[PDB]
Design a protein around this ligand. Structure first.
Ligand SMILES: COC(=O)[C@@H](N)CSC/C=C(\C)CC/C=C(\C)CCC=C(C)C
Ligand SMILES: [Ca+2]
Ligand SMILES: [Ca+2]
Ligand SMILES: [Ca+2]
Ligand SMILES: [Ca+2]
Length: 144
């Protein structure tokens, strides 16, 4: 496990933990999912938490969140989820995620990123070096 990977997990948890109280509730999960264009029901949100709710307190803490993330990346099924996730970023549908498209989504998640921070995220996922993220590059980013 890398110090850099821990830092990313922390930032990812922060995007869900809207009020910063260290736990992610069904309401916070639903808010994130709707900002990504999804519409889960109250029962679907409870199911999502219950899958990883090791202490049964109805909310997600940090190690439970890591468990949730690792299961999603190490899935091998639900590639339609990955295609759906790609479409969330690729809003003009042209097959490439631009820095501007990424900035737009991060803004909808409530993030404040500098121009360099957005370019660094594109750089890290870019494989062929064209300065955008195509679908194959995205698949690799979302996969273990
Ligand atoms: C390592 O730290 C960084 O990269 C920071 N500058 C900001 S990224 C913090 C947020 C996350 C890692 C989780 C959100 C990331 C998502 C949704 C992946 C989108 C990225 C693409 C399509 C290149
Ligand atoms: Ca919270
Ligand atoms: Ca819990
Ligand atoms: Ca695009
Ligand atoms: Ca590329």
């Amino acid at each position: 496990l890398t110090e850099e990977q821990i830092a990313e997990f922390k930032e990812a948890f922060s995007l869900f933990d809207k009020d910063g109280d260290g736990t992610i509730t069904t309401k916070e999960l639903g808010t994130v999912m709707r900002s990504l264009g999804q519409n889960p029901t109250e029962a679907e949100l409870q199911d999502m938490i219950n899958e990883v709710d090791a202490d049964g307190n109805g909310t997600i803490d940090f190690p439970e969140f890591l468990t949730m993330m690792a299961r999603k990346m190490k899935d091998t099924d639900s590639e339609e989820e990955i295609r759906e996730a790609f479409r969330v970023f690729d809003k003009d549908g042209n097959g490439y995620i631009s820095a501007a498209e990424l900035r737009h989504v991060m803004t909808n998640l409530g993030e404040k990123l500098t121009d360099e921070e957005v370019d660094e995220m594109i750089r890290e996922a870019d494989i062929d070096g064209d300065g955008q993220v195509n679908y194959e590059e995205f698949v690799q980013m979302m996969t273990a």
